[PDB]
């Protein structure tokens, strides 16, 4: 990433995209603790 | 010129950083003040036949108008009542959070200087300035005259462990 390109992009943690998957060491079907 | 161009926030006119020594016009101040002032405009309601208690016992109070309120000492809760559950000892002690000056009491204890002079303030403790300001100008004259009249009397203290001497002094 260059300065010009980087100055027009947001952080990945700013979105909900991080809580829409179940990828884990066990497999592709992750269940959260206390579910 | 760097690639900073094109952004709408590029060389913006006026900013937090830019403006660090600029004050609002008196117009705004005035407006605000007036607005706040003009929020409770209305006529009187209720009844007020008799004047509000604002003076010591005995002395009447009809002409002396006071803007500030006065709290009664005889109406406050005691420590025992405070600490009681829901349904000497601490039965005659009160711990009040307020202006000492603005309190109707029989007697008030004040810490004065050795010379007993009321110049600006006393020892500087909480409420001393309030007390001395509330007190009229004649306080100084009374204390001054008392000093002179007494004299020697003001240069002795009761002997430790001497209740008879304390009573005589009193």
């Amino acid at each position: 990433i260059r300065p010009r390109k980087k100055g027009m992009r947001l952080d990945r943690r700013r979105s909900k995209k991080q809580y829409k998957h179940g990828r884990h060491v066990g497999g592709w079907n992750y269940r959260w603790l206390g579910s | 010129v760097r690639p900073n161009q094109g952004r709408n926030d590029y060389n913006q006119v006026g900013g937090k950083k830019r403006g660090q020594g600029v004050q609002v016009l008196p117009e705004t101040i005035r407006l605000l003040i007036e607005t706040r002032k003009a929020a409770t405009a209305g006529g009187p309601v209720g009844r007020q036949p008799l004047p509000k208690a604002t003076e010591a016992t005995g002395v009447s109070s009809w002409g002396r108008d006071r803007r500030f309120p006065i709290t009664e000492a005889l109406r406050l809760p005691t420590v025992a009542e405070v600490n009681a559950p829901w349904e000497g000892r601490l039965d005659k002690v009160v711990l009040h959070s307020g202006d000492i000056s603005r309190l109707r009491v029989d007697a008030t204890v004040v810490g004065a200087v050795r010379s007993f002079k009321t110049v600006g303030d006393g020892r500087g403790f909480t409420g001393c300035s309030a007390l001395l300001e509330g007190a009229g100008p004649f306080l100084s004259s009374f204390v001054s005259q008392q000093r002179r009249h007494l004299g020697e009397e003001l240069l002795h203290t009761p002997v430790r462990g001497d209740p008879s001497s304390a009573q005589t002094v009193a």
Partner: protein
């Protein structure tokens, strides 16, 4: 955060607590759908929520802060602060002294609009500490120079307020000053503004 306030903020804050404050002016958390009592805000016969006596703690702090903030306040805000402290009821002589001094310092730099608000602080019922003869003498002396050398700029409303202040607040007895004020209100070129005031 009393100690973080500026002069500007503090003046209005002071004024708020002095101009017949009401407890219903505060905000509500998820209030009922129906309107709040704040809509009317009329003269009540009682004190909602708490009594006025439960704010001296805060008052003290306010005054202290004012004391500190006095030195970095423009001329315009200085007088407002001055009046707000007296209105509030700042009794602290040590606090008042510094204020007085700064006021004295900045006096000559002021004008009639900043002098009327100053004079408002000497109204009856306020603490007698602010009524320093050395202060009032300089104030009433300075007003005369303004009326003598800048009388064409004063407005009818300003002159009317000054007439009340010089008679009921300052308790002055200067027949020459009173006559000058009276003449500059009916004989000056101010008929248009006098009819619309």
């Amino acid at each position: 955060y009393i100690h973080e306030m500026d002069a500007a903020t503090l003046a209005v804050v002071l004024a708020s607590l002095a101009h017949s404050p009401s407890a219903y002016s505060v905000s509500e958390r998820r209030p009922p759908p129906s309107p709040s009592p704040a809509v009317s805000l009329s003269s009540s016969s009682f004190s909602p929520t708490h009594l006025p006596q439960h704010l001296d703690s805060l008052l003290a702090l306010l005054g202290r802060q004012a004391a500190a903030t006095a030195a970095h306040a423009p001329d315009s805000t200085l007088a407002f602060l001055f009046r707000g402290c007296a209105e509030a009821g700042v009794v602290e002589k040590n606090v008042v002294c510094t204020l007085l001094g700064r006021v004295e310092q900045r006096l000559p730099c002021m004008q009639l609009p900043e002098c009327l608000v100053l004079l408002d602080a000497l109204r009856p019922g306020l603490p007698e500490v602010y009524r320093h003869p050395r202060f009032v003498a300089r104030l009433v002396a300075h007003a005369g120079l303004l009326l003598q050398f800048r009388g064409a700029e004063s407005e009818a409303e300003d002159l009317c307020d000054l007439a009340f202040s010089l008679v009921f607040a300052a308790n002055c007895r200067d027949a020459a000053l009173l006559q000058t004020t009276a003449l500059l209100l009916v004989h000056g070129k101010r008929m248009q503004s006098l009819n619309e005031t």
